[PDB]
Write an enzyme that holds these catalytic residues in place. Structure first.
Site, short mmCIF file in Angstrom:
data_model
loop_
_atom_site.label_atom_id
_atom_site.label_comp_id
_atom_site.label_asym_id
_atom_site.label_seq_id
_atom_site.Cartn_x
_atom_site.Cartn_y
_atom_site.Cartn_z
N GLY A 89 0.82 -1.23 0.00
CA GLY A 89 0.00 0.00 0.00
C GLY A 89 0.84 1.27 0.00
O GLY A 89 2.08 1.16 0.15
N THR A 90 0.19 2.43 -0.15
CA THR A 90 0.84 3.77 -0.19
C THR A 90 1.30 4.14 1.22
O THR A 90 0.83 3.50 2.18
CB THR A 90 -0.09 4.86 -0.76
OG1 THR A 90 -1.12 5.12 0.19
CG2 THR A 90 -0.71 4.48 -2.08
N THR A 91 2.16 5.15 1.35
CA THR A 91 2.75 5.58 2.64
C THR A 91 1.73 6.43 3.41
O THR A 91 1.10 7.31 2.79
CB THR A 91 4.08 6.33 2.46
OG1 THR A 91 4.88 5.64 1.49
CG2 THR A 91 4.83 6.46 3.76
#
Lengths: 241, 250, 111, 231, 243, 240, 235, 244, 195
Positions: E29-31
């Site tokens: 997933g994204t940060t």
């Protein structure tokens, strides 16, 4: 070989899921220790905070179940907190139903009975935890009772749990061979805490700063945990002797 | 969620064996030796107290349990399974008998109710059988003294004397040589201690041995007086001191 | 004891011509000897050229009009936007009312 | 492989194969396009027949007077999810006398699809939806994926060869977003968009499905001779 | 083997492989990050702009629980929404019975016990999200991070997603360089810098920055989204630091 | 509750549990139905590996559902009791609400419906039973013979057989039964039934059961000697 | 084994795809829609000559304005017909009107996906639903165990379907008379049937606005079979 | 899910047999033999106890022969624990019939209901069948003396003489050889003991390895008596027929 | 409803049951048969609450006919009476109890004896030589106490019954429009057409 996936008997009459839950116990790489004084029961546990971003005050494997009962856990924190909430709820209900505070050994037996069900019922996994319950029972006095994923439980003169448990256990056995008594013959809980840390240092062969340890103390009518400065005060006392 | 295991975990193999029951008996074989001997005027049930650690207090772990004032139980196999069976056994003696007839069940019927609980763990959905064999000793007015063995299957058999667990084969042969139909309770206790020494390796004293009797009524253990018909429990646990007294004249 | 019913008064009247129909009702709403509103309409356009009034206990009147209006909406959703004929509307309202046979809507309904 | 038996199992790289297999049913589905301005939101759908004797599977469903969607994938699953939206829109109207915000409509579909991906016995929904609506914050277009992921967009397309229309709308973004107060021009842009996804077949009168909602226009669907204007 | 095919099954190690597999979905997933400050907490997240056709500012990922708690997560976004929906139900029943809004440690264990419960049975899947969340209660500010196993701790700073190691290194520098404490308005700017620095591990698609905050002085203890002038000021600060 | 879908489709489009239920029927003792001009006759094989039987108390192969309808079967005996019980309860329930006994078609349609339900219900296996259901509709003299099978399909037959070696006796009936002229009397119909079983049975001793149903609730079971006379007569005509 | 509601890697439900194979083994059923009415014809296919063919019931009345033909595991269709009839009569009770053919078909198709771990497996039967309503006139629908239904001008289902459907593609036009449709169903059934077509092993039916749904006598169908054979010989 | 660990107890083999029922019968074939013999003036029940130990209490013991009511008894072959579950159901079912109709339950009605319970465990519920075969010996005023047997399939049949458990094949041949219809109870007692003696897997048949019971009209006038034999009575009847 | 009588004699049970069905100030019917045949040799008459009577009668009839078909056997009059008593005994503690009073006349073929059972809506069963339900008892019982002998013929029983109907037609306030008389014996159930 699905007899290794759920809690049914293997051909040699073993429950592998129970055995593997025991191995989950050491996953945290933390050692705990409990001893009894005349007036008190002291439990100590290692405190390893590897990450610098963690809030160290929120990292704890010692729980205040009731005013009188404390519990330290050896195993992963999710299962550890699962056990702690149930133990709190069970101790609260007991008091409401029966009009007196749940004894340490009765709460142990109840939590052990729950653990036993998971070893017999298939849909429920055992919790990968060993629960050490401590108090100063109004009938039995200073009390240590311990639970495991098998649903076994027994009372102790003293006890240790974790990867290097055997070293601590023999260290304590050798002391009680020498002293010839069932407990730490000490007046103040402060010195029973000092004994606990001293005999952990000798057995593990490591030195502790104030942030490397975690201390619970059960006295008559209350169980409490120590602050970093309460432990630091205790570490200074040991060093100056 | 919810128990999706609504199907049997114990099923018949082509050969006709019930795997989980066989494997449960295997767990009982591994278990520490316990025995029971029936005298004319009482019953003795004994077992070794296998200590898990010398820091453990083996007094806090009771292998021999009171079920009713006139019935006691001991086991070989898995301790936790035995502990919950004792809880369930004590309750069923009340719910399905005492709360109906105002008196405690006779040994054979309580034994029957325990056997039913163990049978259901053999057939019901999403459970393994119990990993224990029970020896239940008891007394009742119309049957006198009796000793029963309950197996993981739910089968029970009445015994004059028997052993279960680790060194059962050797213990049973020992009991056959020594048992007669004229044994007095004290003669049965003496034989129980002799038979147990063969299967015990380490320390043999009143702190490593657990032993209870079904004998005479104990008015001193009743806790009250004034009702002539209530005369006290026939179940009594021998003290650590009472065992060591008999180990000198061994 | 709690009485779940009330009387909000007012009266309604429906006449039918050869190619038209009127549904009239006074706008007065009352409880006991007091006026609640001088203009509270109780005759409603329910779509598909059906006008409806449920006169008596206004709470039950509003509840019924609300449910029938909702019934017209779902009739479209379930039967490819088909127009609800007055005779079908009538039969539908019967099932709305009789559904509460043992706790009735205290209203006189005219469409 | 060994981890695609049910939705309750994660693969060793943290994938849900049953959810990915559901996603695959959408890819096989007939292309549908969604795009909007500041005044109107438009669905355009290519309908698919079994043969020359059969009808053309209807792709567009009305949810309320101000909302509706188009479907690509398992049509019965779209009927379940549309029926759920119809009730949620309806509940809002009866209880709060309030038109359901197109954004909340998205959040409700996301949470309904999600529950089918975490429990044993169930399966993921095998359909993708494009929801258009006009509410108190103007015109909206949503893209629903049965993974649970709902996304608000100016324009998009789902189904077989949807990439053609999706590239076109990406190029046309600055033009079609400012087609305000002109329905027929916003439709023309949507019909040109779906034309980038056609192969060997062209848009006929019983083939093309268009829906529109906006400021002074209830959600209405155009089929048959009413779409002849746009070929 | 086959120990990894079923949730709640212990491997011979004593591990639940299915949870470890859920962790892989989180890493993908994204940060997202959380910075604890003087009198509150700041949340920020990376929103990958997949296409020009995404409406800016209109796919909000940070969520509010009650009126005083903020939640952000990395991994399967739907799984995160499910956890917040439960979080809102837990917080509502607490406020109903006890009147006072739910304390952050109390709220943390409510999510913790719920996620832990999804590791107990083979009929449910673990959560495919790590969730960073916190707010302000009667005892001041608290920041938490919760993982698919049900494990959670209190944090000075927290990071999860594809750029977690980059973000963690940047968080540790702030903790070392500010032992007395970071101000709410400073932490908002730092959050913008760290998301931009953690974007290097996801640099194919360019992104959209989203920040929120709870502060006893700045937002009166309530959760608010950072928008307009304060957001553009934080973006500019971040842009200056990468060059 | 136990939920498992035991009856499911295979890649080739077969429901194996339904098809394996038919194999249980193929293992069962042969049952035959033949309808005449004014009667239906149900014949049933009884295997002779069982001597020391008590034929007074042993469950009979042909069961009465009402005073006017009978049911014989092939397959699992224990399974057939559940179908017969439900059929007999529906028989009384129909008389209670309609104020008229069941038609043979209706009673059959119900029994077939029950069987079908067990093929797409969770946690149940299909019935290992096929049935022959014979009788006369209230105030009707037209004979009725119906057959059901585990799948749930049912149909009307001029004559039919089910069970082991049923294909052999079906072969016999297919060339020996004239649709234009069914057995004109009770004697003719019983004989053609006994002949068809003698192709498969062994000895015509205590191996064959015959039940005769006639109009207006007229059902009687033949004894050993009565059947033995048919066996004796058929064999003497055969030696030619 | 594996879940009953499992997706294949190609994004299809195993059990729905396998039930479609069961239907291919079923007996042929053909439906043709005209402006004068809809015709429904089926192959009876008696497994043995002793079985009384008129007891084979593969064409069925749902209401006066809706009829139905079936192909596949025909025992599965009983509860589908029972539902369809109740849905039709219930709508008449609630709305004092006939229920639209499409609304009926959508109601039957709602049962279809109500399986899993609701019933244990999908239906092993496909339905041809033919009717008339005032809104959309004469209609023919193919209802599958997938829960999908298509409207058709003409449609064949069962073993002989793909060959019969190719024939219906050529033969159908928008100006077919009811009599032309009747002969066309007989002609195409005779082509795909194993045993030689007659009045005993094939059945015709039709639904007309005026007279409603009617299953034809064996005498009426026999004359249409004779009229068909004479017309093919006549060029 | 849990599908993985489901044995599917209630399914058909490709040959159309019930796996679990077949395997349960295989289990019963290793259980001690039990014989029932129906005479004109009563019924005999004989059963061999499973390899005894000398320290077993023989008099206060019940393993094979159980009383259902004052007119019906059963001999058991298989798991005893499974049998007692079914015996208690049968006992209650008998009392329900008496409470309803104020008449003792006809034997076949009791046997059918117990057999119907077994049938259920083979068709639905996904549980293992009961590993038990019963010999039912009883009397009612309709059919008089009746022997039945039921097995895990839930199939029951009526007999003049029958065996269940071990060595049924050899036992049935021997009974088929020496049985005749005009036989008396005392003759049937001898046949039962003689058969077990020849089919036993033991060295010699003794009183301690046997349970024995008779259901006679050998009370006083037109009423039935159940006799469950005491150890000493089996010892005497074993000497009287000259087996020991 | 209202009048139901029963007389057991040497070889038969005779049941007389009033033919009137009155609702308000209207006699709706004067030919009503207040009886059901439970089995070939068992007949049950009933009186009590409207609807409840026939509903309970037919429910019992269905259960006895179901038993007959299952066991291929006729339950004894004693057995049927005990079933019917238990059903009423259940009913009396239900949410809405059956308000039905029944007489059961049967011929036990195993004993070759007539049997008459009186059972009220509470489930109060008694075996009697002669039985009545409602106000009828108050005139008949004293009359039968006098004239009844245990060894009477069916013909004597019918004359003894004529005496009871005559007394009721003289002293009862309501017109019950005469009785339907039925005889239960070794040859089953038959109706007297001229009474």
């Amino acid at each position: 070989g699905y007899d290794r996936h759920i809690t049914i008997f293997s051909p040699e009459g073993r429950l592998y899921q129970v055995e593997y839950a025991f191995k989950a116990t050491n996953q945290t790489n933390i050692n705990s220790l409990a001893v009894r004084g005349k007036d008190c029961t002291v439990v100590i546990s290692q405190k390893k905070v590897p990450d610098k971003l963690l809030d160290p005050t929120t990292v704890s494997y010692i729980f205040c179940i009731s005013r009188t009962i404390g519990m330290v856990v050896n195993g992963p924190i999710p299962d550890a907190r699962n056990a702690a909430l149930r133990a709190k709820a069970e101790a609260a209900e007991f008091r409401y139903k029966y009009g007196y505070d749940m004894p340490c050994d009765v709460l142990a037996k109840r939590m052990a009975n729950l653990s036993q069900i998971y070893t017999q019922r298939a849909y429920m996994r055992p919790l990968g935890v060993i629960l050490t319950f401590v108090s100063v029972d109004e009938e039995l006095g200073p009390s240590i009772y311990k639970t495991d994923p098998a649903g076994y439980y027994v009372g102790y003169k003293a006890t240790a749990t974790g990867p290097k448990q055997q070293e601590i256990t023999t260290n304590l056995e050798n002391h009680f061979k020498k002293s010839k008594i069932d407990h730490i013959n000490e007046e103040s809980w402060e010195k029973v805490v000092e004994f606990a840390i001293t005999h952990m240092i000798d057995a593990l062969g490591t030195e502790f700063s104030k942030n490397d340890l975690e201390v619970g103390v059960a006295t008559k009518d209350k169980f409490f945990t120590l602050s970093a400065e309460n432990i630091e005060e205790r570490l200074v006392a040991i060093a100056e002797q | 969620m919810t128990d999706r295991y609504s199907f049997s975990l114990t099923t018949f193999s082509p050969s006709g064996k019930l795997g989980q029951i066989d494997y449960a008996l295997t767990a009982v074989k591994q278990g520490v030796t316990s025995l029971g001997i029936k005298a004319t005027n009482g019953v003795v049930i004994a077992t070794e107290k296998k200590s898990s650690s010398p820091l453990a207090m083996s007094e806090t772990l009771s292998k021999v349990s009171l079920l009713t004032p006139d019935i006691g139980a001991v086991y070989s196999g898995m301790g936790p399974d035995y502990r919950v069976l004792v809880d369930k056994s004590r309750k069923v003696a009340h719910t399905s008998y005492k709360r109906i007839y105002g008196e405690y069940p006779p040994t054979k019927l309580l034994v029957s109710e325990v056997a039913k609980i163990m049978q259901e763990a053999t057939q019901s959905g999403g459970v393994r059988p119990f990993g224990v064999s029970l020896l239940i000793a008891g007394h009742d007015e119309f049957n006198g003294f009796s000793l029963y063995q309950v197996d993981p299957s739910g089968s029970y058999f009445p015994w004059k004397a028997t052993a279960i667990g680790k060194g059962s084969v050797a213990a049973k042969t020992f009991l056959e040589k020594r048992w007669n139909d004229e044994l007095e309770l004290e003669d049965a206790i003496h034989i129980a201690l002799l038979t147990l020494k063969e299967s015990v390796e380490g320390e043999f004293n009143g702190d490593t041995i657990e032993l209870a009797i079904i004998g005479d009524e104990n008015p001193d253990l009743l806790g009250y007086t004034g009702i002539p018909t209530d005369k006290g429990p026939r179940f009594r646990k021998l003290t650590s001191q009472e065992i060591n007294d008999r180990l000198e004249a061994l | 004891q709690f009485n779940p019913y009330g009387d909000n008064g007012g009266t309604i009247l429906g006449i039918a011509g050869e190619d038209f129909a009127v549904l009239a009702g006074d706008t007065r709403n009352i409880t006991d000897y007091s006026i609640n509103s001088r203009y509270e309409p109780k005759v409603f356009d329910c779509g598909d050229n059906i006008v409806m009034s449920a006169n008596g206990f206004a709470a039950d009147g509003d509840a019924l009009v609300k449910r029938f209006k909702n019934s017209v909406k779902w009739y479209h959703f379930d039967h490819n936007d088909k127009k609800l004929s007055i005779n079908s509307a009538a039969r539908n309202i019967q099932h709305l009312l009789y559904g509460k046979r043992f706790f009735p809507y205290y209203v006189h309904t005219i469409i | 492989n060994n981890y695609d038996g049910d939705t309750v199992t994660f693969s060793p790289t943290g994938r849900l194969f049953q959810v990915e297999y559901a996603l695959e049913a959408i890819k096989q589905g007939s292309v549908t396009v969604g795009l909007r301005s500041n005044t109107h939101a438009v669905l355009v759908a290519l309908k698919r027949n079994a043969d020359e004797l059969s009808s053309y599977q209807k792709k567009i469903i009305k949810c309320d007077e101000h909302m509706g969607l188009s479907l690509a994938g398992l049509a019965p699953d779209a009927r379940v999810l549309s029926n759920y939206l119809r009730q949620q829109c309806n509940y809002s109207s009866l209880v709060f006398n309030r038109k359901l915000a197109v954004e909340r409509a998205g959040h409700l579909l996301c949470d309904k699809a999600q529950k089918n991906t975490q429990s044993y016995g169930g399966r993921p929904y095998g359909v993708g939806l494009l929801i258009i609506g006009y509410d108190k914050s103007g015109a909206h277009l949503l893209e629903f994926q049965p993974s649970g992921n709902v996304t608000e967009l100016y324009g998009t397309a789902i189904g077989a060869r949807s990439q053609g229309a999706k590239t076109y709308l990406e190029r046309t973004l600055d033009t079609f977003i400012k087609i305000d107060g002109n329905p027929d021009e916003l439709i023309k842009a949507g019909v040109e968009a779906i034309s980038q996804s056609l192969r060997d077949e062209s848009l006929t009168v019983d083939n093309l499905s268009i829906a529109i909602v906006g400021k002074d226009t209830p959600f209405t669907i155009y089929d048959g001779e009413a779409v002849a204007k746009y070929i | 083997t086959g120990y990894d095919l079923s949730n709640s099954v212990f491997s011979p190690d004593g591990r639940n492989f299915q949870v470890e597999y859920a962790v892989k979905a989180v890493e993908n997933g994204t940060t997202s990050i959380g910075i604890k400050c003087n009198d509150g907490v700041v949340f920020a997240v990376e929103k990958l702009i997949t296409s020009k056709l995404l409406v800016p500012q209109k796919n909000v990922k940070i969520q509010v629980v009650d009126r005083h708690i903020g939640c952000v997560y990395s991994g399967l976004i739907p799984d995160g929404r499910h956890l917040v929906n439960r979080g809102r139900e837990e917080a509502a029943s607490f406020k109903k019975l006890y009147k006072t809004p739910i304390p952050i440690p109390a709220f943390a264990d409510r999510l913790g016990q719920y996620v832990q419960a999804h590791t107990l049975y083979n009929s449910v899947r673990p959560f495919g999200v790590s969730t960073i969340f916190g707010g302000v209660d009667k005892n001041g500010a608290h920041l938490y991070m919760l993982e698919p196993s049900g494990s959670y701790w209190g944090y000075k700073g927290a990071a999860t997603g594809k750029g977690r190691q980059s973000a963690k290194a940047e968080l540790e520098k702030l903790v070392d360089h500010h032992p007395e404490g970071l101000s709410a308005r400073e932490a908002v700017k730092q959050a913008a810098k760290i998301i931009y620095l953690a974007h290097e591990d996801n640099k194919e698609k360019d992104f959209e920055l989203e920040i929120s905050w709870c502060s006893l002085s700045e937002t009166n203890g309530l959760h608010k989204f950072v928008k307009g002038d304060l957001l553009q000021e934080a973006i500019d600060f971040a842009q200056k630091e990468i060059n | 509750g136990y939920d498992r879908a035991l009856s499911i489709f295979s890649p080739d489009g077969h429901i194996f549990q339904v098809e394996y239920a038919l194999e249980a029927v193929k293992r069962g003792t042969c049952a035959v139905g033949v309808k005449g001009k004014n009667c239906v006759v149900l014949g049933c094989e009884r295997r002779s590996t069982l001597k020391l039987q008590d034929t007074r108390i042993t469950p009979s192969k042909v069961s009465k559902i009402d005073s006017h309808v009978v049911l014989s079967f092939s397959g699992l005996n224990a399974d057939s009791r559940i179908l017969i019980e439900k059929a007999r309860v529906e028989a009384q329930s129909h008389r209670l609400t309609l104020e008229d006994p069941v038609t043979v078609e209706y009673l059959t349609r119900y029994v077939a419906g029950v069987q079908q339900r067990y093929t797409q219900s969770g946690g149940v296996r299909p019935f290992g039973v096929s049935t022959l259901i014979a009788g006369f509709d209230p105030r009707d003299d037209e004979p009725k013979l119906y057959q059901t099978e585990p799948s749930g399909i049912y149909s009307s037959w001029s004559a039919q057989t089910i069970g082991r070696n049923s294909k052999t006796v079906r072969e016999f009936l297919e060339k020996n039964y004239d649709r234009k002229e069914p057995p004109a009397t009770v004697e003719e119909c019983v004989k053609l039934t006994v002949r068809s079983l003698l192709e498969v049975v062994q000895t015509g001793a205590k191996n064959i059961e015959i039940t005769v149903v006639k109009p207006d609730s007229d059902i009687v079971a033949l004894s050993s000697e009565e059947i033995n006379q048919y066996v004796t007569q058929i064999e003497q005509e055969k030696q030619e | 084994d594996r879940g009953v509601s499992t997706f294949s890697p190609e994004g299809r439900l195993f059990q729905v795809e396998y039930s479609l194979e069961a239907i291919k083994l079923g007996s042929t059923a053909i439906g043709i829609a005209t402006k004068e009415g809809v015709v429904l014809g089926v192959e009876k296919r008696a497994t043995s000559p002793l079985l009384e063919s008129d007891s084979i019931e593969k064409i069925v009345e749902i209401d006066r304005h809706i009829g139905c033909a079936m192909s596949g595991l025909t025992a599965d269709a009983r509860s589908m017909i029972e539902h369809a009839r109740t849905a039709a009569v219930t709508h008449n009770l609630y709305y004092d009107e006939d229920i639209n053919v499409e609304s009926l078909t959508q109601s039957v198709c709602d049962l279809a996906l109500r399986f899993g771990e609701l019933m244990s497996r999908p239906f092993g039967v496909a339905l041809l639903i033919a009717g008339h309503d005032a809104d959309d006139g004469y209609q023919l629908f193919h209802a599958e165990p997938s829960g999908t239904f298509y409207r058709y001008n003409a449609k064949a289902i069962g073993s002989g379907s793909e060959g019969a459907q190719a024939e219906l593609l050529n033969e159908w036009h928008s100006s077919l008379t009811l009599k032309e449709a009747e002969l066309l169903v007989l002609k195409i059934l005779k082509q795909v049937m194993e045993e030689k077509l007659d009045e005993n092993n094939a059945q015709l039916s039709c639904i007309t606005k005026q007279d409603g749904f009617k299953i034809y006598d064996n005498e009426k169908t026999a004359e249409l079979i004779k009229e068909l054979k004479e017309k093919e010989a006549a060029e | 899910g849990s599908r993985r660990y489901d044995s599917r107890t209630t399914i058909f083999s490709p040959e159309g047999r019930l796996y679990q029922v077949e395997y349960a019968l295989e289990s019963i074939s290793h259980a001690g033999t039990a014989i029932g013999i129906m005479a004109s003036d009563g019924i005999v029940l004989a059963a061999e106890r499973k390899v005894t130990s000398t320290l077993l209490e023989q008099d206060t013991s019940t393993e094979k022969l159980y009383k259902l009511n004052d007119k019906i008894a059963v001999a058991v072959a298989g798991l005893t624990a499974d049998a007692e579950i079914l015996i208690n159901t049968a006992r209650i079912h008998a009392q329900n019939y008496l409470k309803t109709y104020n008449e003792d339950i006809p034997v076949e009605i009791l046997v059918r209901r117990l057999s119907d319970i077994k049938q259920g465990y083979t068709q639905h519920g996904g549980l293992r069948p009961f590993g038990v075969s019963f010999i039912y010996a009883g009397y009612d005023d309709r059919y008089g003396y009746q022997l039945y047997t039921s097995n895990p399939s839930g199939n029951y049949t009526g007999w003049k003489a029958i065996s269940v458990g071990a060595n049924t094949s050899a036992a049935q041949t021997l009974l088929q050889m020496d049985y005749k219809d005009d036989m008396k109870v005392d003759d049937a007692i001898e046949l039962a003991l003689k058969t077990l003696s020849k089919t036993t897997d033991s060295s010699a048949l003794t009183y301690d390895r046997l349970e024995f019971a008779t259901i006679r009209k050998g009370a006083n006038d037109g009423e039935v008596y159940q006799k469950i034999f005491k150890p000493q009575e089996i010892k005497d009847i074993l000497v009287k027929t000259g087996i020991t | 409803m209202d009048i139901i009588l029963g007389i057991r004699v040497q070889d038969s049970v005779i049941l007389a049951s009033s033919k009137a069905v009155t609702r308000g100030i209207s006699v709706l019917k004067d030919s009503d048969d207040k009886t059901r045949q439970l089995s070939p040799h068992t007949l049950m008459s009933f009186a009590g609450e409207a609807g409840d009577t026939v509903q309970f009668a037919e429910y019992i009839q269905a259960n006895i006919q179901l038993y007959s078909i299952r066991e291929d056997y006729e339950l004894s009059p004693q057995a049927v009476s005990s079933f019917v008593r238990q059903e009423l005994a259940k009913s009396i503690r239900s949410r809405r109890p059956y308000q039905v009073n029944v007489l059961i006349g049967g011929y036990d073929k195993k004993k070759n004896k007539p049997e008459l059972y009186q059972i009220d809506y509470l489930g109060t069963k008694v075996e009697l030589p002669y039985g009545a339900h409602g106000y009828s008892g108050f005139y008949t019982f004293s009359l039968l106490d006098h004239h009844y002998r245990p060894d009477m013929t069916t013909e004597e029983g019918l004359d003894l019954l004529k005496l009871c109907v005559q007394e009721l037609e003289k002293r009862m306030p309501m017109d019950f429009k005469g009785v339907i008389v039925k005889i239960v014996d070794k040859d089953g159930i038959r109706q007297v057409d001229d009474f």
